[PDB]
C-alpha cells in the first residue's frame, strides 16, 4: 500500500499517489445544485453535481465553493468532494492507504480537528497527516533555505525557513489572492460595458483572467501607453459566440497584488510584505534569505510577475546585496509535488498519526504533530 | 610519541602539536543550542553544534560561552569542546600523546581538579600538566626576566619574574578583559541608533571592535578632535547590507582598559596596576624589571595600545629609569608559542603528572606539581 496526498487548495484540488512526479486528478472543487424547474423524466436528474462534471454544466445549476480563504465554511458539501475524489478519480479504498493533507499557516484550530475526525470516523484510513503548504513547497525545489510565497484560490503566506528550522514569528497571512482578483476583474469590466453577475459568469471571468492578464514591469508607462493609441487590446470570444476586447484592464487585474488600495485593504502588496517579513528575522540570516524566493501556486503563474518581484525587492533592500528569484515553470503543482517527497522519504514514515493514537487521544492529538 | 599543547583560553581555544611554531586549529570556544522549533523531517539537524561551524550559522543558535573570566562554569559542553578539538580538529587519539593545558593565575582550586580528573579518567591520556598562562608567555620572548601582561578575553594579570623565579606576592588580576569590552562597545553603540541584543548579534560586535578600534595616544586631546567633523568616520558593513558609521566611538571602547571608571569598576586600569605591581617587588629588581614588559593575549593587538602604555609608565615612574615595552608582532598566539616549547624542552619532561602517580593519589595531586 502506498500513501495519498490531496493538496486541497480552495480551487483546483490536486491529488495523486506518492512517489509520482505529477498529480493524478485535478478538478474545480465546486458543488452544483439545480435551481430551475426541471420537468423531464428522461434526464438522469441527480441532486448535487460535483467536480468538473458540474463545471461542464454551469448555466443550469448554481456554484458554491466550500472553501473560502483557506478555511472550510461548510462541511457536508466538502465531504462529498473527498468522497467523489476517492471513488471516481481514483477508485481506491481510503482505509487501504495512508493519506497526507495540506493547509495554510495560521489556520483556525477548529478547522484542523474536524478535518481529522472526519478523515477517520468516515474512512478509517491507517494514518493521516496535515502539512503546512509552504513547507512542502520548499521540499519541491529541493532546497533547505528560502522564503516560500504561495498564493492561489485565495490565501497568501510568506514563510521563511533558514535550515531545517522555520521561524514561526515571521509568517504573514493575507486574504488578497486569486479569488478577489477574479471578483475585481468582474467589477472593472463593467466600465467597458459588460455584465457578469451569476456564478456561471465567474468561471468565464476566471478563464479570461488565466490567459489575457500579465503583470506590468512598470505600471504608469503601461497606463500611459495603453491609454493613448496602442495595441494592448486583445480579442476574446465568449463560449456563446460573442467577442470582447480588454484593452487596458488586463494588467490592472494582477496589479492589485502590489497595491491593495485598489480594493481598499490597508495592508501592503506582496512586494512589500516579503521584505517586511525578512526583517523580522535575525541579521546573520538575511544574506541567503534574500537569495531564495521560491514561489508556488496558481497566482504565481502570471507572465510578468517573475520579474516585477525582482525589481521591487531591489527597491527596498540594501543595494549591495544580491537577489535571486526561483520560479520553476512547473510550479502549478509545487504544493503537491513536495507532498510526495515528504511522504516517500524514509525517516518521515514514523511522523504519522495511526488510528491507534487517535483512539486514545481523540482529534486533539494533531496539535503536537504539525 | 609527541606532546600536545591546547591553550584553553576563554575566547578562541588554541591547540597544536608540541614543537612546531604555529598552532594547528583555532576556533571560538562556543556551544550551539538550536531554539526555534524546526519542521523539516528530511534534513539531519544535529542536536547541538560546537565550533567554528556553530559559529558560521549564528542564525538559529544560542551561543553560550562555557568559560567566564578564566574559570569553567558549564562542564558538559566544555567537555564536548575537548571531544571536538581532539577528534574532528586533529584526528589523533588523546591516549597516544601526553598533553599540556594552560590556565590563568589565581583561579578556584576546584577548577584545576575537575580539569585533571576529566582529562585523565575520561580520555585515558598518559600524562597531563597545567601551567600558568603567564610563565608560558615569557618563554615566547625567550627572556628569563620581565613582567608579563597577558590578557586575552576574560582575564588580565601581571606576573613579575626576575631570574627564573616568580614573585607570588605581586600577581595582580582584573576582570576587565576583552569580553567585557564587547559588552561596553555594544552599549555605546546604542548612542548612534543601532541596537544589538541577541547573542548572535553580540558576536558581530567582536567582528568590529577587533578591526576598527585603536587606542588614543592621548584621550582628552583626541576626543576633542573628532568632536568637530574629521576623518575619524569609518563605515563597516554588516553581513546583511546596512552599514554603520562609528565616528567617535571607535577610540572610546579600548580606552576602558586604561579607565575602568567607564564600566564603574574601582580598580584602576592596567596603566596603573603594572606600575603598582612592580613596586611590590624589591628595590634592586626594578632596574631591569622596568625594561621588559612582554605583552601577550588577544587584547594586546590594538594599534595604539603598544604606545599609550609606554607613554603612561614614564609619566609616573622615576624619570631617570628607562622603559622598553617589548611587544612582539604575533603576540596573539604567544601563550601557545610558549607551551609548544616548554613541552618539547628536554629537562621539563620530568615534571609531568603520569597516570601512574595520579591513580594512587587521585586528582588532588595537581596542587603540588604546579
Amino acid at each position: 500500500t502506498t500513501a495519498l496526498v490531496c493538496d486541497n487548495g480552495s480551487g483546483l484540488v490536486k491529488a495523486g499517489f506518492a512517489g509520482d512526479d505529477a498529480p493524478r486528478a485535478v478538478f474545480p472543487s465546486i458543488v452544483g445544485r439545480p435551481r430551475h424547474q426541471g420537468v423531464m423524466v428522461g434526464m438522469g436528474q441527480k441532486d448535487s453535481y460535483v467536480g468538473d462534471e458540474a463545471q461542464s454544466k454551469r448555466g443550469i445549476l448554481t456554484l458554491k465553493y466550500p472553501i473560502e480563504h483557506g478555511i472550510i465554511t461548510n462541511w457536508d458539501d466538502m465531504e462529498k468532494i473527498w468522497h467523489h475524489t476517492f471513488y471516481n478519480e481514483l477508485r481506491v479504498a481510503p482505509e487501504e492507504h495512508p493519506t497526507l493533507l495540506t493547509e495554510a499557516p495560521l489556520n483556525p484550530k477548529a478547522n484542523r480537528e474536524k478535518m481529522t475526525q472526519i478523515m477517520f470516523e468516515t474512512f478509517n484510513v491507517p494514518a493521516m497527516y496535515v502539512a503546512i503548504q509552504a513547507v512542502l513547497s520548499l521540499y519541491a525545489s529541493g532546497r533547505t533555505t528560502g522564503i516560500v510565497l504561495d498564493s492561489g484560490d485565495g490565501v497568501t503566506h510568506n514563510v521563511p525557513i533558514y535550515e531545517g528550522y522555520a521561524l514561526p514569528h515571521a509568517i504573514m497571512r493575507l486574504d488578497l489572492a486569486g479569488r478577489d482578483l477574479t471578483d475585481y476583474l468582474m467589477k472593472i469590466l463593467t466600465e467597458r460595458g459588460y455584465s457578469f453577475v451569476t456564478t456561471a459568469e465567474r468561471e468565464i471571468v476566471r478563464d479570461i483572467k488565466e490567459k489575457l492578464c500579465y503583470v506590468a514591469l512598470d505600471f504608469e508607462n503601461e497606463m500611459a501607453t495603453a491609454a493613448s493609441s496602442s495595441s494592448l487590446e486583445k480579442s476574446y470570444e465568449l463560449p456563446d459566440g460573442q467577442v470582447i476586447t480588454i484593452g487596458n484592464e488586463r494588467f490592472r487585474c494582477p496589479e492589485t497584488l502590489f497595491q491593495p488600495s485598489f480594493i481598499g485593504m490597508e495592508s501592503a502588496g506582496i512586494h512589500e510584505t516579503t521584505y517586511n517579513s525578512i526583517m523580522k528575522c535575525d541579521i546573520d540570516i538575511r544574506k541567503d534569505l534574500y537569495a531564495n524566493n521560491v514561489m508556488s501556486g496558481g497566482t504565481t503563474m502570471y507572465p510578468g510577475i517573475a520579474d516585477r518581484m525582482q525589481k521591487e525587492i531591489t527597491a527596498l533592500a540594501p543595494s549591495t546585496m544580491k537577489i535571486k528569484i526561483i520560479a520553476p515553470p512547473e510550479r502549478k503543482y509545487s504544493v503537491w509535488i513536495g507532498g510526495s517527497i515528504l511522504a516517500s522519504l524514509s525517516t518521515f514514515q514514523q511522523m504519522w498519526i495511526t488510528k491507534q493514537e487517535y483512539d486514545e487521544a481523540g482529534p486533539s492529538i494533531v496539535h503536537r504533530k504539525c | 610519541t609527541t606532546a600536545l599543547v591546547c591553550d584553553n583560553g576563554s575566547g578562541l581555544v588554541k591547540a597544536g602539536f608540541a614543537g612546531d611554531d604555529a598552532p594547528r586549529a583555532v576556533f571560538p570556544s562556543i556551544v550551539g543550542r538550536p531554539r526555534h522549533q524546526g519542521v523539516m523531517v528530511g534534513m539531519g539537524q544535529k542536536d547541538s553544534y560546537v565550533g567554528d561551524e556553530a559559529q558560521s550559522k549564528r542564525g538559529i543558535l544560542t551561543l553560550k560561552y562555557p568559560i567566564e573570566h578564566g574559570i569553567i562554569t558549564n562542564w558538559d559542553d566544555m567537555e564536548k569542546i575537548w571531544h571536538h578539538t581532539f577528534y574532528n580538529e586533529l584526528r589523533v587519539a588523546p591516549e597516544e600523546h601526553p598533553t599540556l593545558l594552560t590556565e590563568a593565575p589565581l583561579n578556584p582550586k576546584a577548577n584545576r581538579e575537575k580539569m585533571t580528573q576529566i582529562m585523565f579518567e575520561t580520555f585515558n591520556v598518559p600524562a597531563m600538566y597545567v601551567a600558568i598562562q603567564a610563565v608560558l608567555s615569557l618563554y615566547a620572548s625567550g627572556r628569563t626576566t620581565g613582567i608579563v601582561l597577558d590578557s586575552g578575553d576574560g582575564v588580565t594579570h601581571n606576573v613579575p619574574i626576575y631570574e627564573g623565579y616568580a614573585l607570588p606576592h605581586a600577581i595582580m588580576r582584573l576582570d576587565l578583559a576583552g569580553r567585557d569590552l564587547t559588552d561596553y562597545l555594544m552599549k555605546i553603540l546604542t548612542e548612534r541608533g543601532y541596537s544589538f541584543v541577541t547573542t548572535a548579534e553580540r558576536e558581530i560586535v567582536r567582528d568590529i571592535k577587533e578591526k576598527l578600534c585603536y587606542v588614543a595616544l592621548d584621550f582628552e586631546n583626541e576626543m576633542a578632535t573628532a568632536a568637530s567633523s574629521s576623518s575619524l568616520e569609518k563605515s563597516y558593513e554588516l553581513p546583511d547590507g546596512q552599514v554603520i558609521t562609528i565616528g567617535n566611538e571607535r577610540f572610546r571602547c579600548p580606552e576602558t582598559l586604561f579607565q575602568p571608571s567607564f564600566i564603574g569598576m574601582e580598580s584602576a586600569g592596567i596603566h596603573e596596576t603594572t606600575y603598582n605591581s612592580i613596586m611590590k617587588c624589591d628595590i634592586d629588581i626594578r632596574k631591569d624589571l622596568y625594561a621588559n614588559n612582554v605583552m601577550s593575549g588577544g587584547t594586546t593587538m590594538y594599534p595604539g595600545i603598544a604606545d599609550r602604555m609606554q607613554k603612561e609608565i614614564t609619566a609616573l615612574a622615576p624619570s631617570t629609569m628607562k622603559i622598553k615595552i617589548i611587544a612582539p608582532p604575533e603576540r596573539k598566539y604567544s601563550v601557545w608559542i610558549g607551551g609548544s616549547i616548554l613541552a618539547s624542552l628536554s629537562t621539563f619532561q620530568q615534571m609531568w603528572i603520569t597516570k601512574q602517580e595520579y591513580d594512587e593519589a587521585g586528582p588532588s595531586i595537581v596542587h603540588r606539581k604546579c
Binding site: 512517489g19 512526479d21 521540499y139 529541493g142 512547473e330 510526495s340 524514509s346 | 534534513m43 539531519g44
Partner: peptide, 15 residues
Amino acid sequence: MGVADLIKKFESISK
C-alpha cells in the same frame, strides 16, 4: 528533476 530523483537528494543529506 523528478520527485523520484529528489528523494535521494534528501535521503543522502538526511545523514
